[PDB]
Coordinates of C-alpha atoms and ligand atoms in Angstrom, one line a residue:
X1 CA -32.1 8.0 -13.6
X2 CA -28.4 7.7 -14.6
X3 CA -26.6 10.9 -15.6
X4 CA -23.7 11.3 -18.1
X5 CA -21.5 10.9 -19.9
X6 CA -21.8 14.7 -20.2
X7 CA -23.4 16.3 -17.1
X8 CA -23.1 18.8 -14.4
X9 CA -22.7 17.5 -10.8
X10 CA -23.4 19.8 -7.8
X11 CA -21.6 19.1 -4.5
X12 CA -23.7 20.5 -1.6
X13 CA -24.2 20.2 2.2
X14 CA -27.5 18.8 3.4
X15 CA -29.0 16.9 6.4
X16 CA -29.7 13.2 5.8
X17 CA -30.9 10.3 8.0
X18 CA -30.0 7.1 6.3
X19 CA -30.3 5.0 9.6
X20 CA -32.8 7.3 11.3
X21 CA -30.1 9.6 12.9
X22 CA -29.9 13.1 11.3
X23 CA -26.5 14.5 10.5
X24 CA -25.1 17.0 7.9
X25 CA -23.2 15.5 4.9
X26 CA -21.3 16.3 1.7
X27 CA -23.4 15.1 -1.2
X28 CA -23.2 14.7 -5.0
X29 CA -26.5 15.3 -6.7
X30 CA -28.4 15.8 -3.5
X31 CA -28.4 12.1 -2.4
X32 CA -26.5 9.4 -0.6
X33 CA -25.1 7.6 -2.5
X34 CA -24.7 10.1 -5.3
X35 CA -26.4 9.5 -8.7
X36 CA -24.9 6.9 -11.0
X37 CA -22.7 8.4 -13.7
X38 CA -22.8 6.2 -16.8
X39 CA -21.8 5.8 -20.4
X40 CA -20.5 3.3 -22.9
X41 CA -16.9 2.1 -23.4
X42 CA -14.8 4.7 -25.2
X43 CA -17.1 7.5 -24.5
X44 CA -16.0 11.1 -23.7
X45 CA -17.1 12.0 -20.1
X46 CA -17.3 15.6 -19.2
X47 CA -18.4 15.9 -15.6
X48 CA -18.6 19.6 -14.7
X49 CA -18.3 19.6 -10.9
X50 CA -19.8 22.6 -9.1
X51 CA -18.4 23.1 -5.6
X52 CA -21.4 24.6 -3.6
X53 CA -20.1 23.6 -0.2
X54 CA -20.3 26.1 2.7
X55 CA -20.0 24.0 5.9
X56 CA -16.3 24.2 7.1
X57 CA -16.8 21.2 9.4
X58 CA -16.6 18.9 6.4
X59 CA -14.2 21.1 4.3
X60 CA -15.5 23.6 1.8
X61 CA -12.9 22.6 -0.9
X62 CA -13.3 19.4 -2.9
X63 CA -11.8 17.2 -5.6
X64 CA -13.3 14.0 -7.2
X65 CA -11.6 10.8 -8.3
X66 CA -13.0 8.4 -10.9
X67 CA -11.9 5.2 -9.3
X68 CA -10.4 2.6 -11.6
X69 CA -10.5 4.7 -14.8
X70 CA -7.0 4.9 -16.3
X71 CA -6.9 8.5 -17.3
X72 CA -4.3 7.9 -20.0
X73 CA -3.2 11.3 -21.3
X74 CA -5.5 13.0 -18.8
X75 CA -3.6 12.6 -15.5
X76 CA -4.8 16.1 -14.6
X77 CA -8.4 14.8 -14.4
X78 CA -7.6 11.9 -12.0
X79 CA -8.7 13.8 -8.8
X80 CA -6.3 13.0 -5.9
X81 CA -5.7 16.3 -4.1
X82 CA -2.1 17.4 -4.1
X83 CA -1.1 14.6 -6.4
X84 CA -2.8 15.6 -9.7
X85 CA -4.6 18.9 -8.8
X86 CA -5.2 21.5 -6.2
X87 CA -8.8 21.3 -4.8
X88 CA -11.7 23.2 -6.4
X89 CA -12.8 26.1 -4.1
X90 CA -16.3 26.9 -3.1
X91 CA -18.3 28.8 -5.6
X92 CA -16.2 27.5 -8.5
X93 CA -16.6 24.6 -11.0
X94 CA -14.3 22.4 -12.9
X95 CA -14.8 20.2 -16.0
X96 CA -13.3 16.7 -15.6
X97 CA -13.0 15.9 -19.4
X98 CA -11.6 12.5 -20.1
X99 CA -12.2 9.4 -22.2
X100 CA -12.6 5.7 -21.3
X101 CA -10.9 3.7 -24.1
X102 CA -10.6 0.0 -23.6
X103 CA -12.5 -0.1 -20.3
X104 CA -16.0 -1.4 -19.5
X105 CA -17.2 -2.5 -16.1
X106 CA -18.3 -1.3 -12.7
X107 CA -16.5 1.7 -11.1
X108 CA -17.3 4.5 -8.6
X109 CA -16.5 8.1 -7.9
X110 CA -15.6 9.8 -4.6
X111 CA -14.0 12.8 -3.0
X112 CA -10.2 12.5 -2.9
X113 CA -9.6 15.3 -0.4
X114 CA -8.7 14.3 3.1
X115 CA -11.5 12.0 4.6
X116 CA -14.3 13.9 2.9
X117 CA -15.7 11.0 1.0
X118 CA -16.6 9.4 4.3
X119 CA -18.9 12.5 4.9
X120 CA -21.0 11.4 1.8
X121 CA -19.4 12.2 -1.5
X122 CA -19.5 8.7 -3.1
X123 CA -21.5 7.2 -5.9
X124 CA -21.5 4.5 -8.7
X125 CA -19.8 5.0 -12.1
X126 CA -20.8 2.4 -14.8
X127 CA -19.2 2.0 -18.3
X128 CA -21.4 -0.4 -20.2
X129 CA -20.2 -2.5 -23.1
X130 CA -22.6 -2.7 -26.2
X131 CA -20.8 -5.9 -27.2
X132 CA -20.3 -7.3 -23.7
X133 CA -19.0 -10.9 -24.0
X134 CA -21.1 -11.7 -20.9
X135 CA -24.3 -10.3 -22.3
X136 CA -26.0 -13.6 -22.8
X137 CA -25.6 -14.6 -19.2
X138 CA -28.4 -12.3 -17.9
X139 CA -31.6 -10.5 -18.8
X140 CA -31.5 -7.3 -16.8
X141 CA -28.6 -4.8 -16.2
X142 CA -29.6 -1.2 -15.2
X143 CA -29.7 1.3 -12.4
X144 CA -31.9 -1.1 -10.4
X145 CA -29.2 -3.9 -10.4
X146 CA -26.5 -1.7 -8.7
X147 CA -25.9 -2.7 -5.1
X148 CA -23.8 -0.3 -3.0
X149 CA -22.3 -1.2 0.4
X150 CA -21.3 1.7 2.7
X151 CA -20.1 2.4 6.2
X152 CA -21.8 5.4 7.9
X153 CA -20.7 7.5 10.9
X154 CA -22.6 9.7 13.2
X155 CA -19.4 11.7 14.1
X156 CA -18.2 13.9 11.2
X157 CA -14.9 12.8 9.6
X158 CA -12.9 15.9 10.5
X159 CA -13.5 14.9 14.1
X160 CA -12.0 11.4 13.8
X161 CA -8.6 11.2 15.5
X162 CA -5.8 10.6 13.0
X163 CA -4.4 7.0 13.1
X164 CA -7.2 5.8 15.4
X165 CA -9.3 2.7 15.0
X166 CA -12.4 4.5 13.9
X167 CA -15.7 2.5 13.9
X168 CA -18.9 3.0 12.0
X169 CA -22.5 3.4 13.3
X170 CA -24.4 1.7 10.5
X171 CA -24.0 -0.4 7.4
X172 CA -26.0 1.1 4.5
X173 CA -27.1 -1.1 1.5
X174 CA -28.3 1.1 -1.4
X175 CA -28.2 4.1 1.0
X176 CA -30.4 2.6 3.9
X177 CA -29.7 0.5 6.9
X178 CA -30.0 0.5 10.7
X179 CA -27.8 1.8 13.4
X180 CA -25.7 -0.6 15.6
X181 CA -26.6 1.2 18.8
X182 CA -29.9 2.9 19.6
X183 CA -31.2 0.8 16.8
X184 CA -34.6 2.1 15.3
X185 CA -36.7 0.2 12.7
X186 CA -35.9 2.8 10.0
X187 CA -36.6 1.8 6.4
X188 CA -34.5 -1.0 4.7
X189 CA -33.6 -1.1 1.1
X190 CA -35.6 -3.4 -1.3
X191 CA -34.1 -5.0 -4.4
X192 CA -36.9 -6.3 -6.6
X193 CA -36.6 -9.3 -9.0
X194 CA -39.1 -11.2 -11.2
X195 CA -39.2 -15.0 -10.8
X196 CA -37.3 -16.7 -13.7
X197 CA -35.2 -13.7 -14.8
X198 CA -31.4 -13.3 -14.5
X199 CA -29.8 -10.1 -13.2
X200 CA -26.4 -8.6 -13.5
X201 CA -25.9 -7.4 -10.0
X202 CA -23.1 -4.8 -9.9
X203 CA -21.8 -4.9 -6.3
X204 CA -19.8 -1.8 -5.3
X205 CA -18.0 -1.2 -2.0
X206 CA -18.1 2.5 -1.3
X207 CA -16.6 1.8 2.1
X208 CA -14.2 4.2 3.9
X209 CA -12.9 1.2 6.0
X210 CA -14.7 -2.1 6.7
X211 CA -14.8 -5.1 4.5
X212 CA -18.1 -6.9 4.2
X213 CA -19.2 -10.5 4.1
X214 CA -21.9 -10.3 1.5
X215 CA -24.6 -13.0 0.9
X216 CA -28.2 -13.4 -0.2
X217 CA -30.2 -16.1 1.7
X218 CA -31.3 -19.0 -0.5
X219 CA -29.3 -17.7 -3.5
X220 CA -25.9 -18.1 -4.9
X221 CA -23.9 -15.7 -7.0
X222 CA -22.0 -16.2 -10.3
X223 CA -19.1 -13.8 -10.5
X224 CA -18.4 -12.5 -14.1
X225 CA -16.5 -9.2 -13.4
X226 CA -13.8 -8.2 -10.8
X227 CA -12.9 -4.4 -10.5
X228 CA -13.7 -3.8 -14.2
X229 CA -12.0 -7.0 -15.5
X230 CA -14.3 -9.7 -17.0
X231 CA -13.8 -13.1 -15.3
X232 CA -14.6 -16.7 -16.0
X233 CA -17.9 -17.6 -14.3
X234 CA -17.3 -18.5 -10.6
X235 CA -20.3 -19.5 -8.5
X236 CA -20.1 -18.6 -4.8
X237 CA -22.5 -18.3 -1.8
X238 CA -20.6 -15.5 0.0
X239 CA -18.3 -12.6 -1.2
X240 CA -15.8 -10.9 1.2
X241 CA -15.5 -7.5 -0.5
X242 CA -12.9 -5.0 0.6
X243 CA -13.1 -1.2 0.5
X244 CA -13.3 0.1 -3.1
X245 CA -13.6 -3.3 -4.8
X246 CA -16.4 -4.2 -7.3
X247 CA -17.9 -7.5 -8.5
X248 CA -20.6 -8.2 -11.1
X249 CA -22.5 -11.4 -10.3
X250 CA -25.4 -13.1 -12.0
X251 CA -28.4 -13.5 -9.7
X252 CA -30.8 -16.2 -11.0
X253 CA -34.3 -15.5 -9.5
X254 CA -34.9 -19.2 -9.2
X255 CA -36.1 -19.5 -5.6
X256 CA -39.8 -19.6 -4.5
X257 CA -41.6 -16.2 -4.8
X258 CA -40.9 -14.6 -1.4
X259 CA -38.7 -12.3 0.6
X260 CA -35.0 -13.1 1.3
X261 CA -32.5 -11.3 3.5
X262 CA -29.5 -9.6 1.9
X263 CA -26.6 -9.6 4.3
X264 CA -23.4 -7.4 4.6
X265 CA -21.5 -8.2 7.8
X266 CA -18.6 -5.7 8.4
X267 CA -15.3 -6.7 10.0
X268 CA -15.8 -4.0 12.7
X269 CA -18.8 -2.3 14.2
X270 CA -22.0 -4.3 14.8
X271 CA -21.9 -8.0 14.5
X272 CA -24.9 -10.0 13.5
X273 CA -28.3 -8.9 12.3
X274 CA -30.3 -8.1 15.5
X275 CA -33.0 -5.5 14.8
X276 CA -32.3 -5.8 11.1
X277 CA -28.8 -4.1 11.1
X278 CA -26.4 -5.2 8.3
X279 CA -29.4 -6.1 6.2
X280 CA -31.6 -5.3 3.1
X281 CA -34.4 -7.2 1.4
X282 CA -34.6 -9.2 -1.8
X283 CA -38.3 -9.2 -2.8
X284 CA -39.8 -11.2 -5.6
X285 CA -42.6 -9.6 -7.6
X286 CA -45.9 -11.0 -6.1
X287 CA -44.4 -11.5 -2.6
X288 CA -46.2 -10.1 0.4
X289 CA -44.8 -6.8 1.6
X290 CA -43.2 -8.1 4.8
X291 CA -39.7 -8.7 6.2
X292 CA -37.9 -12.0 5.2
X293 CA -37.9 -14.9 7.6
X294 CA -34.9 -16.6 6.1
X295 CA -31.8 -17.8 7.9
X296 CA -28.1 -17.6 7.1
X297 CA -26.1 -20.9 7.2
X298 CA -23.8 -21.3 10.1
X299 CA -20.9 -21.5 7.6
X300 CA -20.8 -20.8 4.0
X301 CA -19.8 -23.7 1.9
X302 CA -18.5 -21.9 -1.2
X303 CA -17.1 -18.6 -0.3
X304 CA -15.1 -16.5 -2.8
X305 CA -11.3 -17.2 -2.6
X306 CA -9.4 -14.7 -4.8
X307 CA -7.1 -17.5 -6.4
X308 CA -10.3 -19.1 -7.8
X309 CA -10.9 -16.1 -10.1
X310 CA -9.4 -16.0 -13.6
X311 CA -9.8 -13.5 -16.4
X312 CA -12.3 -14.2 -19.2
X313 CA -9.7 -13.0 -21.8
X314 CA -6.2 -14.5 -22.0
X315 CA -4.5 -11.7 -20.1
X316 CA -1.5 -13.8 -18.7
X317 CA 1.1 -12.1 -16.5
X318 CA 3.9 -9.8 -17.7
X319 CA 7.5 -10.7 -16.8
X320 CA 9.1 -14.0 -15.8
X321 CA 7.7 -16.7 -13.6
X322 CA 9.5 -16.1 -10.4
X323 CA 9.8 -13.5 -7.6
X324 CA 11.8 -10.5 -8.9
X325 CA 11.2 -11.6 -12.5
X326 CA 10.5 -8.0 -13.7
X327 CA 12.3 -5.1 -15.1
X328 CA 11.7 -3.1 -12.0
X329 CA 11.0 -5.4 -9.0
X330 CA 10.1 -3.6 -5.8
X331 CA 9.4 -4.6 -2.2
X332 CA 7.6 -2.0 -0.1
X333 CA 8.2 -1.8 3.7
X334 CA 4.7 -1.1 5.0
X335 CA 4.6 -0.1 8.7
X336 CA 2.5 1.5 11.4
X337 CA 3.6 3.2 14.7
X338 CA 2.3 5.8 17.0
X339 CA -0.7 6.8 15.0
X340 CA 1.1 7.1 11.6
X341 CA 1.6 4.7 8.7
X342 CA 4.7 4.7 6.5
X343 CA 5.9 3.3 3.2
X344 CA 9.7 2.7 2.9
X345 CA 10.2 4.7 6.1
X346 CA 8.2 7.8 5.0
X347 CA 4.7 8.8 6.2
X348 CA 2.7 10.5 3.4
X349 CA 1.8 14.1 4.1
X350 CA 0.3 15.9 1.0
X351 CA 2.7 18.5 -0.6
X352 CA 1.8 22.2 -1.2
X353 CA 2.4 22.0 -4.9
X354 CA 0.6 19.0 -6.6
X355 CA 3.1 16.4 -7.8
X356 CA 1.9 16.7 -11.4
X357 CA 2.4 20.6 -11.3
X358 CA 5.9 20.0 -9.9
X359 CA 6.8 17.8 -12.8
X360 CA 5.2 20.2 -15.4
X361 CA 7.3 23.0 -13.8
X362 CA 10.5 21.0 -14.6
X363 CA 11.4 18.8 -11.6
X364 CA 12.4 15.7 -13.3
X365 CA 13.6 13.2 -10.9
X366 CA 11.9 11.7 -8.0
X367 CA 14.5 13.0 -5.5
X368 CA 13.6 16.6 -6.8
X369 CA 9.9 15.9 -6.0
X370 CA 8.0 16.7 -2.8
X371 CA 7.2 15.1 -0.5
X372 CA 10.7 14.0 -0.1
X373 CA 10.9 10.2 0.0
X374 CA 7.2 9.8 -1.0
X375 CA 7.7 9.7 -4.8
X376 CA 9.2 6.7 -6.6
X377 CA 10.0 7.0 -10.3
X378 CA 9.0 4.2 -12.6
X379 CA 10.7 3.6 -16.0
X380 CA 8.6 3.7 -19.2
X381 CA 7.6 0.5 -21.1
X382 CA 8.7 -1.8 -18.3
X383 CA 7.3 -4.6 -16.3
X384 CA 6.9 -3.5 -12.6
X385 CA 6.5 -6.0 -9.7
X386 CA 5.4 -4.7 -6.3
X387 CA 5.5 -6.9 -3.3
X388 CA 3.3 -5.6 -0.4
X389 CA 4.1 -7.8 2.7
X390 CA 1.4 -7.4 5.4
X391 CA 1.9 -7.0 9.2
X392 CA 1.1 -3.3 9.7
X393 CA -1.6 -2.8 12.3
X394 CA -5.2 -2.2 11.2
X395 CA -5.3 -4.9 8.5
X396 CA -6.4 -6.3 6.3
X397 CA -5.3 -3.4 4.1
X398 CA -6.9 -3.0 0.6
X399 CA -4.2 -1.5 -1.5
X400 CA -5.2 0.5 -4.6
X401 CA -3.1 1.8 -7.6
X402 CA -4.3 4.7 -9.7
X403 CA -3.9 4.8 -13.5
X404 CA -3.7 1.0 -13.8
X405 CA -5.1 -2.4 -13.1
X406 CA -2.6 -5.2 -12.2
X407 CA -2.2 -9.0 -12.1
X408 CA -2.5 -10.4 -8.6
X409 CA 0.4 -12.7 -8.7
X410 CA 0.0 -13.7 -5.0
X411 CA -3.1 -13.3 -2.9
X412 CA -3.9 -13.2 0.8
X413 CA -3.6 -16.2 3.0
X414 CA -1.8 -18.3 0.3
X415 CA 1.9 -18.5 -0.1
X416 CA 1.9 -19.8 -3.7
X417 CA 2.3 -17.3 -6.6
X418 CA 0.4 -17.6 -9.9
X419 CA 2.4 -16.5 -13.0
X420 CA -0.1 -18.1 -15.4
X421 CA -3.7 -17.0 -15.0
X422 CA -4.4 -14.8 -11.9
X423 CA -7.2 -12.3 -11.9
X424 CA -6.4 -8.7 -12.7
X425 CA -8.0 -6.0 -10.5
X426 CA -7.3 -2.5 -9.1
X427 CA -7.7 -2.9 -5.2
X428 CA -6.4 -5.9 -3.4
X429 CA -6.3 -7.1 0.2
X430 CA -2.7 -7.6 1.3
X431 CA -3.8 -10.1 3.9
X432 CA -2.3 -11.0 7.2
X433 CA 1.0 -11.5 9.1
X434 CA 3.6 -13.3 6.9
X435 CA 1.7 -12.8 3.6
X436 CA 3.4 -11.5 0.5
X437 CA 0.6 -10.2 -1.8
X438 CA 2.3 -9.1 -5.0
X439 CA 1.1 -7.3 -8.1
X440 CA 2.5 -6.7 -11.6
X441 CA 1.8 -4.3 -14.4
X442 CA 3.5 -2.6 -17.4
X443 CA 4.2 1.1 -17.6
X444 CA 2.4 2.5 -20.6
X445 CA 0.7 5.5 -18.9
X446 CA 2.9 8.5 -18.1
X447 CA 2.0 10.5 -15.0
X448 CA 2.0 10.5 -11.2
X449 CA -0.2 7.6 -9.9
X450 CA -1.1 7.3 -6.2
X451 CA -0.6 4.0 -4.5
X452 CA -2.3 3.7 -1.0
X453 CA -4.4 1.8 1.4
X454 CA -8.1 2.5 0.5
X455 CA -9.1 2.5 4.2
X456 CA -9.5 6.3 4.1
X457 CA -8.5 6.8 7.7
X458 CA -5.2 5.0 6.9
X459 CA -4.5 7.2 3.8
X460 CA -5.1 10.3 6.1
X461 CA -2.6 8.8 8.5
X462 CA 0.1 8.5 5.8
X463 CA -0.3 5.0 4.2
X464 CA 0.6 6.1 0.6
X465 CA 3.3 6.8 -1.9
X466 CA 3.3 8.2 -5.5
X467 CA 4.6 6.3 -8.5
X468 CA 5.9 9.0 -10.9
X469 CA 5.6 6.9 -14.0
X470 CA 7.7 8.0 -17.0
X471 CA 8.6 11.5 -15.6
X472 CA 10.3 12.5 -18.9
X473 CA 7.2 12.0 -21.0
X474 CA 4.6 13.3 -18.4
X475 CA 4.3 16.8 -19.9
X476 CA 4.0 15.8 -23.6
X477 CA 1.6 13.0 -22.7
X478 CA -0.7 15.1 -20.5
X479 CA -1.5 18.5 -22.0
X480 CA -3.4 20.5 -19.5
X481 CA -6.5 22.8 -19.9
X482 CA -6.4 26.4 -18.7
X483 CA -9.0 25.7 -16.1
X484 CA -6.6 23.1 -14.5
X485 CA -3.7 25.7 -14.6
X486 CA -6.0 28.1 -12.8
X487 CA -6.8 25.7 -9.8
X488 CA -3.7 26.1 -7.7
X489 CA -3.5 30.0 -8.0
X490 CA -7.2 30.2 -7.0
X491 CA -6.8 27.7 -4.1
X492 CA -3.6 29.2 -2.8
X493 CA -5.1 32.8 -2.9
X494 CA -8.3 31.6 -1.1
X495 CA -6.2 29.9 1.6
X496 CA -3.5 32.6 1.9
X497 CA -0.8 30.1 0.8
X498 CA 2.5 31.3 -0.8
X499 CA 4.1 29.0 -3.5
Ligands
LIG501 C1 8.2 -11.0 -0.6 O1 8.7 -11.3 -1.8 C2 9.9 -10.4 -2.1 C3 10.3 -10.7 -3.6 O2 9.2 -10.4 -4.5 C4 11.0 -10.8 -1.1 O3 12.1 -9.9 -1.4 C5 13.4 -10.4 -1.2 O4 13.7 -10.0 0.2 C6 15.0 -10.5 0.6 C7 15.3 -10.1 2.0 O5 14.1 -10.5 2.8 C8 16.1 -9.9 -0.4 O6 17.3 -10.6 -0.2 C9 15.8 -10.0 -1.9 O7 16.6 -9.1 -2.7 C10 14.3 -9.7 -2.2 N1 13.9 -9.9 -3.7 C11 13.8 -11.1 -4.3 C12 14.3 -12.4 -3.6 O8 13.4 -11.3 -5.5 C13 10.5 -10.5 0.3 O9 11.4 -11.1 1.3 C14 9.2 -11.3 0.5 N2 8.6 -11.0 1.9 C15 8.0 -11.9 2.6 C16 7.5 -11.4 4.0 O10 7.8 -13.0 2.4
LIG502 C1 -3.3 -21.1 -3.6 O1 -2.9 -20.4 -4.7 C2 -2.4 -21.2 -5.8 C3 -1.9 -20.4 -6.9 O2 -2.9 -19.5 -7.4 C4 -3.5 -22.2 -6.2 O3 -3.0 -23.2 -7.1 C5 -3.6 -23.4 -8.4 O4 -4.6 -24.3 -8.0 C6 -5.3 -24.5 -9.3 C7 -6.7 -25.1 -8.9 O5 -6.5 -26.4 -8.4 C8 -4.5 -25.3 -10.3 O6 -5.1 -25.4 -11.5 C9 -3.2 -24.5 -10.5 O7 -2.3 -25.2 -11.3 C10 -2.5 -24.1 -9.3 N1 -1.4 -23.2 -9.6 C11 -0.2 -23.2 -8.9 C12 0.9 -22.3 -9.4 O8 0.0 -24.0 -8.0 C13 -4.2 -22.9 -5.0 O9 -5.3 -23.6 -5.4 C14 -4.5 -21.9 -3.9 N2 -4.9 -22.7 -2.7 C15 -6.2 -22.7 -2.3 C16 -6.4 -23.5 -0.9 O10 -7.1 -22.3 -2.9
CU503 CU1 -11.2 4.9 -4.8
CU504 CU1 -8.3 5.2 -7.7
CU505 CU1 -5.1 0.3 5.7
CU506 CU1 -6.4 7.3 -4.3
NA507 NA1 3.5 -14.1 -19.4

């Protein structure tokens, strides 16, 4: 069952064996992935998070981010540790109480402390639309049509060297899959469909690092949503999905009753499908209970290309139709050396006092804010352009902005910008050497918003900056509850920190 929009959520330690290998984890709701949190557009969510963690090897503090939800007027509920809150300590709870006006789509939730989400705290978050403009394109849309793609590690995250090329041990589809080495025939996930029906498949990357080449043998996929943004229909036979992205696609169950492989090939880790790695099963009702015998093509003839996507609504692009044609045009210098990433010459290291609390305490320019050099102010009610030229080691890097979605004016692997009708989204691959992926948005949401690579190992190694959007209006726009004001005193007392 789905939970929410008003619910408790307990965060616990437990042993799990999703690929046949047992290890301890950090779990929401006792499962990997965690339960789906759901509601309708405009609902009030109140997710009371109970931190019941006791194993220090995965950290006993926690904080949860609601990925892709704008948090307008509720910046304090966004979740990134040391940007919008101090962590919740063990034995305590915290009500993330916010609203979702003007958003409907496929999202997710995850720990936003260190690399803790890699240790298991990740799950889907769906905001349904009772008047969805795409409703007539499918018959079924429910918890059974969510498809999660996850990397899974046998080594615990706090034992992964910082800045290293860290590689997974299994791909998990809906929480199950097989290990790349010492492979055992452990159970594969089954997605069941009825011949003749059409399904809204909600594809969620909960990855900490790899991108996946996702396909379904014998089937094609008609994209209708990108990171929460309704799209024109685009039919493809393969989707390359980067960490933290989401797509909805229509699956037409129009092939002969049978069993078909679902494939998710990561860019690192095990290559291919030997022993049923990187795989799950699409089973039609009435098919024999047996593994598929289907083949992938040698090449995919209609792969997703990001410039082919266009919004369903007339969203346009803010600003003027040329590079630098914005009120505040920025170009970030994105670099890596010696195990650490940097943005504009500064490697991100979380501050002792969360950025939001520094601003509420009266620091009101970005040079007054800590970490020094890691906070850029943005002016209010202005068009912002951010160019993100690639080249830093460890690519392709999927950059994500909190508090906002954005027009993708230039995409990976294509030098031509689009100032007319590009897709809007919240996480974007910045591509390869010589690319100049560029995003635009307007500043109508006061508060400190994280911008970072969503490869969690890279964030840990410093690949982040904070956009302090409309510092002067942050306090009036974001009144804070007492329980939020209590978090930093409690955290600092528990950890013997003076501030
Ligand atoms: C990516 O595009 C940005 C503009 O959006 C380019 O920025 C210019 O960079 C040159 C120096 O390289 C400066 O003289 C200009 O002031 C910048 N802004 C402009 C022209 O609007 C950036 O060079 C591009 N990067 C790559 C690798 O193509
Ligand atoms: C590279 O990106 C550009 C810009 O998004 C794409 O150009 C558009 O192509 C569409 C489809 O043919 C035309 O309707 C638009 O007028 C083009 N816009 C511009 C500004 O040129 C282009 O198709 C992409 N290249 C590839 C190989 O997909
Ligand atoms: Cu996220
Ligand atoms: Cu986010
Ligand atoms: Cu990265
Ligand atoms: Cu983040
Ligand atoms: Na415009």
